[PDB]
Structure 1
Amino acid sequence: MLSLDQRIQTLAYEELNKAVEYHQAKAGTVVVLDARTGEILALANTPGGRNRAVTDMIEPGAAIKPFVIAKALDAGKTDLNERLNTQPYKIGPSPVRDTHVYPSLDVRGIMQKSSNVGTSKLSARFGAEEMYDFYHELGIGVRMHSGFPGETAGLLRNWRRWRPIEQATMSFGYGLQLSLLQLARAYTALTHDGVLLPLSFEKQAVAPQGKRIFKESTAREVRNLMVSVTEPGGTGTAGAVDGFDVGAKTGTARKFYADNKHVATFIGFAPAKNPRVIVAVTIDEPTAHGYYGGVVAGPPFKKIMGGSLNILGISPTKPLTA
């Protein structure tokens, strides 16, 4: 009744190592989930030993943004028509800025281009306590109880202690921490139509009892926005998979912060409209051939996702061209 798939596990570990070596990185992790039941199909770590997917806390960076955008849509604090001013700004001395100046974006653009500014403005429409409860409901700070030793709850600071700038940076993934397994888990709220899943190391005959975070319509709209990340104009085109539409988010978190020391993340699901698989890839401190999540973690995501769909017998939803 173990949920692991050895063929997916082998594929994930082989592609993970190829990427870690090619980019001359220190380490990497991969999680592959059943997008419908939360069954864990593969967990891969390199270099060997410690189960970093389970034990290692990371700041998720921009990989948290889909949930902030989803929450803002779900509560009616924005909609798919609003064009937000996304010029850089400061809260006191601390800047909030994107990799480019975008004068304005709608929420599709905020997702597609990965705007820290736009996401922080959406989050700022909620009180600190509301955002704190929301992050907790996503499971940040809540142990997975995977059964592995060395597992931590993650980090979610008490909202009463938050500075306004800290609520802002949390909304684009700094100042809170979770493991790649917890982050991959959060994505089941988007794939499983607004219902967060527990995840399991056992095969699930039916999707288990979960917990609603978003309306079903919100999740479906947000999955559609995330397809823009793998299409031209998005930050994650390296993750597009032949024959499928892929909903994804890229992340490029600085470590501590540092100039040129990063954690590159790529997380996505497919078929985007009716997801079957979530693949999450993190590459720790690439030093060659790029450092952003799309360029670094996209290519292994593409290979692991495409191979996982084929292994599982999922038919392409559009004609193959490659």
Structure 2
Amino acid sequence: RSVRHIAIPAHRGLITDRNGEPLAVSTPVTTLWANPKELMTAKERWPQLAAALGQDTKLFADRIEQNAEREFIYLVRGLTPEQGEGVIALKVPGVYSIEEFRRFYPAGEVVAHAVGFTDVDDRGREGIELAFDEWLAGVPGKRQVLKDRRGRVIKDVQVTKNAKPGKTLALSIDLRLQYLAHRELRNALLENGAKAGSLVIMDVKTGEILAMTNQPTYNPNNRRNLQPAAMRNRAMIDVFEPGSTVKPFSMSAALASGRWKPSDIVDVYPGTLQIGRYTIRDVSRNSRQLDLTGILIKSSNVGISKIAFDIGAESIYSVMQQVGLGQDTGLGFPGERVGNLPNHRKWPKAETATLAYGYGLSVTAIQLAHAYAALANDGKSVPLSMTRVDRVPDGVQVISPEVASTVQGMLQQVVEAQGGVFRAQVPGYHAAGKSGTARKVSRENAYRSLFAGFAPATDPRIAMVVVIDEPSKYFGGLVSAPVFSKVMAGALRLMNVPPDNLPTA
């Protein structure tokens, strides 16, 4: 007698990793709904129905009696096809089913922050699911069904508009590398008794983000009792002052200025330098004079500041801006933070020095990895991508290949030379990188352990950033280096990259 114009869900598009491994799959579920006007005519059936739904007898009865005037209530949503058909087989008057779609995340917490999740209505709410919701969602259809005066659906009349399925999306993530990264970062936090962390791996030639993992994390298939801290995609929303990890870009500015050469010597004695009301301090007051490579190895704040006064902060600012520090990544990720790299018309001495040793700016882990990928790719910046790319993108030469090559060699000495971060070495390969201690001024002042590098030195393929938040187990400045080593070793092997430092493995 009556007529209703309901909808037909679209099969939400599959999300895969770059090799086609499934990251988010739309699966069939059965939702049960009732017409209370019909249920009210079969009350002797309610206890059996209530038990099949895992509901208390009297509470289920109360719920039906409270809604007896309606023609529609939900009984349960998202049952497997088998469960739904099993309740339908009870032949309870007024109980109906509809088949919907529901996401399943086969890798669970391993890639939770990148992929995000959907609504109970299959709508993208976080991460890629949100950002690409238009691509993934498709277009629903339109169905028609007739009803009586009691609201009883008599017959499905026809189908009006055919649903249109969403489109497949292949991410840049390599799930083999994501597992390695997720496993090693997690083990690292437990061993150092750390709070949170991030690890980013990217292809320096294509800009593809091959892994992006954070701790803590969560299972998107089971979001009960979910803590807000666990949902933060720290690689893109946690901002910090990168500290010594951007001294290599101060150096690039120096070697590009025409005024400095690697063999130059800077006097750092006595490990401090006064500028007005401020005092610059070196951790290693062991040294009196350092060459340019030694300044990075010892992480001399005094040394890099003296270079900065000579070349000027503008030259340093320009390199840091051009490699993407505190600049929009273009990834358009939900909640992504851009940081801050403030310019000045005139640079005072203090602001000059603090920029040079990495406290005059705020960045994300993704930006820091992008910047190291520019240095690794022989000075050529390529845009970041969260999706698989089919051609090497056009890059921008932001650092001359000669300077990039020199600084590459210095960072390789940072890892390999005496007194350097030896725990960063990758067996079988020549790796290069730089360690640092981050700072997020807030009222608070959090300290993070950072390592950023790339490999292999002969033809760099991937860049990596490891962030470990305030390790409690407190010489923690070199806590991230061993994570870089293990993950870089596993990544190079998984990507079939030929070793260039035998004998080591």
**Which of the five TM-score ranges fits, normalised by the shorter chain?**
over 0.9
Q: Which amino acid letter does the alignment assign opposite residue 215 of structure 1?
A: S
The structure having more radius of gyration, on CA atoms, is 2
Aligned to 1:209: 394
Q: Which amino acid letter does the alignment assign opposite residue 193 of structure 2?
A: Q
Aligned to 1:57: 239
Q: Which amino acid letter does the alignment assign opposite residue 10 of structure 1?
A: Y
In structure 2, the CA distance between the partners of 1:135 and 1:279, relative to structure 1 (3 Å rule), is: closer
> Hey, what's the Cα distance between the residues in 1 that align with 2:442 and 2:292?
28
Mapping 1:160-175, distance limit 5 Å = 160=345, 162-175=347-360
Residue of structure 2 aligned with 1:307, choices 486, 490, 493: 490
Aligned to 2:47: none
Shift of 1:111: 1.6
Q: Which amino acid letter does the alignment assign opposite residue 192 of structure 1?
A: N
Equivalent residues of 1:220, 1:273 under 8 A apart: no
Aligned to 2:277: 93
Deviation by residue 1:47-69 (Cα, 9 ceiling, x = unmatched): 12211111111100100011110
In structure 2, the CA distance between the partners of 1:289 and 1:128, relative to structure 1 (3 Å rule), is: closer
Equivalent residues of 1:128, 1:167 under 8 A apart: yes
Equivalent residues of 1:24, 1:287 under 8 A apart: yes
Aligned to 1:250: 435
In structure 2, the CA distance between the partners of 1:228 and 1:259, relative to structure 1 (3 Å rule), is: farther
Q: Does 1:69 align with 2:251?
A: yes
Task: State the SS of the aligned residue for 1:269.
Answer: strand
Aligned-residue Cα RMSD (Å) equals 2.0
> Hey, what's the Cα distance between the residues in 2 that align with 1:35 and 1:140?
16
Residue of structure 2 aligned with 1:176, choices 353, 361, 368: 361
Q: Which amino acid letter does the alignment assign opposite residue 38 of structure 1?
A: G
Deviation by residue 1:81-103 (Cα, 9 ceiling, x = unmatched): 21111222110121112112221
Equivalent residues of 1:224, 1:273 under 8 A apart: no
Higher normalized strand content (fraction of residues) = 2
Of stretches 254-263 and 278-287 in structure 1, the one that deviates more from structure 2 is 254-263
Q: Does 1:298 align with 2:467?
A: no
Equivalent residues of 1:253, 1:263 under 8 A apart: yes
> Hey, what's the Cα distance between the residues in 2 that align with 1:261 and 1:156?
19
Q: Does 1:34 align with 2:216?
A: no
> Hey, what's the Cα distance between the residues in 1 that align with 2:388 and 2:419?
35
Shift of 1:304: 0.5
In structure 2, the CA distance between the partners of 1:55 and 1:258, relative to structure 1 (3 Å rule), is: closer
> Hey, what's the Cα distance between the residues in 1 that align with 2:294 and 2:443?
27
Shift of 1:36: 1.6
Aligned to 1:286: 471
Aligned to 2:79: none
> Hey, what's the Cα distance between the residues in 2 that align with 1:279 and 1:23?
20
> Hey, what's the Cα distance between the residues in 2 that align with 1:212 and 1:63?
21
> Hey, what's the Cα distance between the residues in 1 that align with 2:391 and 2:402?
22
Instruction: Report the number of matched residues.
Output: 320
> Hey, what's the Cα distance between the residues in 2 that align with 1:288 and 1:9?
26
In structure 2, the CA distance between the partners of 1:232 and 1:137, relative to structure 1 (3 Å rule), is: closer
Q: Which amino acid letter does the alignment assign opposite residue 485 of structure 2?
A: K
In structure 2, the CA distance between the partners of 1:249 and 1:3, relative to structure 1 (3 Å rule), is: same
Q: Does 1:220 align with 2:405?
A: yes
> Hey, what's the Cα distance between the residues in 2 that align with 1:110 and 1:242?
25
| Runs of 5+ consecutive residues of structure 1 not aligned to the other structure | none
In structure 2, the CA distance between the partners of 1:312 and 1:137, relative to structure 1 (3 Å rule), is: same
Shift of 1:128: 3.6
Task: State the SS of the aligned residue for 2:329.
Answer: coil
In structure 2, the CA distance between the partners of 1:267 and 1:128, relative to structure 1 (3 Å rule), is: closer
Of stretches 197-206 and 22-31 in structure 1, the one that deviates more from structure 2 is 197-206
Equivalent residues of 2:246, 2:358 under 8 A apart: yes
Shift of 1:126: 3.1
> Hey, what's the Cα distance between the residues in 2 that align with 1:112 and 1:213?
24
Aligned to 1:137: 322
Aligned to 1:44: 213
Shift of 1:176: 0.6
Question: Could you tell me the percent identity over the aligned residues?
Answer: 40
Equivalent residues of 1:113, 1:233 under 8 A apart: no
> Hey, what's the Cα distance between the residues in 2 that align with 1:220 and 1:214?
10
Shift of 1:203: 2.8
Shift of 1:320: 4.1
Q: Does 1:146 align with 2:327?
A: no
Mapping 1:266-285, distance limit 5 Å = 266-285=451-470
Task: State the SS of the aligned residue for 2:310.
Answer: coil
Aligned to 2:20: none
> Hey, what's the Cα distance between the residues in 1 that align with 2:200 and 2:489?
14
| Runs of 5+ consecutive residues of structure 2 not aligned to the other structure | 1-169, 218-230
Shift of 1:121: 1.7
Equivalent residues of 2:458, 2:500 under 8 A apart: no
Q: Which has the higher contact order (CA 8 A, sep 6+)?
A: 1
Of stretches 118-127 and 157-166 in structure 1, the one that deviates more from structure 2 is 157-166
Task: State the SS of the aligned residue for 2:345.
Answer: helix
> Hey, what's the Cα distance between the residues in 1 that align with 2:456 and 2:322?
26
Task: State the SS of the aligned residue for 1:173.
Answer: coil
> Hey, what's the Cα distance between the residues in 2 that align with 1:308 and 1:241?
11
> Hey, what's the Cα distance between the residues in 2 that align with 1:6 and 1:320?
29
Shift of 1:256: 3.3
Of stretches 248-257 and 93-102 in structure 1, the one that deviates more from structure 2 is 248-257
> Hey, what's the Cα distance between the residues in 2 that align with 1:163 and 1:140?
21
> Hey, what's the Cα distance between the residues in 1 that align with 2:426 and 2:315?
37
Shift of 1:232: 4.3
Shift of 1:318: 2.6
Equivalent residues of 1:242, 1:306 under 8 A apart: yes
Equivalent residues of 1:228, 1:234 under 8 A apart: no
Task: State the SS of the aligned residue for 2:464.
Answer: strand
Shift of 1:254: 4.3
Q: Which amino acid letter does the alignment assign opposite residue 274 of structure 2?
A: K
Shift of 1:77: 2.1
